[PDB]
Design a protein around this ligand. Structure first.
Ligand SMILES: *[C@@H]1O[C@H](CO)[C@@H](O[C@@H]2O[C@H](CO)[C@@H](O)[C@H](O)[C@@H]2O)[C@H](O)[C@H]1NC(C)=O
Ligand SMILES: *[C@@H]1O[C@H](CO)[C@@H](O)[C@H](O)[C@H]1NC(C)=O
Lengths: 96, 49
């Protein structure tokens, strides 16, 4: 019985505990570096097991996630970039 | 020294240290930590320095 001026359907595959991670005002590697839901979130998330399409014999590694960002992620912002995280004071560009 | 100990004791007998006469920069804290849980209550970790 509700009307929305717009609807955004953000989709991604994530681990089990990381579902409890995704919520308005949470913390952790995903809640801070990969997906930060805004505190005044008007919307809601959906999660169900997909062990048949994201799994196969010999394993699968197609998916990715970031644990090294220079700061926290502002809500609803993508940070797709491959830059080596600086540790200490040496750039060590090009090589891990 | 606090984060590079070798024998962090058990929870039943928790090691207790004191920090005084310092300049406390937590960048070195962020360095030696593949963090899993930084839930901070009293202060905001971003606004900590
Ligand atoms: C908790 O563990 C700390 C690091 O392992 C201890 O700090 C050091 O302890 C050594 C002796 O183990 C001291 O020589 C050194 O100066 C420094 O204080 C700390 O003492 C220890 N505390 C307790 C209550 O066990
Ligand atoms: C502890 O200090 C030594 C100093 O050589 C260093 O090699 C080691 O990585 C440090 N370990 C941690 C957990 O900080």
């Amino acid at each position: 019985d509700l009307c929305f001026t717009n609807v955004y359907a953000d989709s991604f595959v994530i681990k089990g505990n990381e579902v409890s991670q995704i919520a308005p005002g949470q913390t952790g590697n995903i809640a801070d570096y990969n997906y930060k839901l805004p505190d005044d979130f008007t919307g809601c998330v959906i999660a169900w097991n997909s062990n048949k399409l994201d799994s196969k014999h010999s394993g699968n590694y197609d998916y990715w996630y970031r644990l090294f960002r220079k700061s926290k992620l502002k809500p609803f912002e993508r940070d797709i970039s491959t830059e080596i995280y600086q540790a200490g004071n040496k750039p060590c560009k090009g090589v891990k | 020294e606090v984060f590079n100990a070798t024998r962090f004791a058990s929870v039943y007998a928790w090691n207790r240290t004191r920090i005084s006469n310092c300049v406390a920069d937590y960048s070195v804290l962020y360095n030696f930590a593949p963090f899993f849980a930084f839930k901070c209550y009293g202060v905001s970790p971003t606004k900590l320095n």
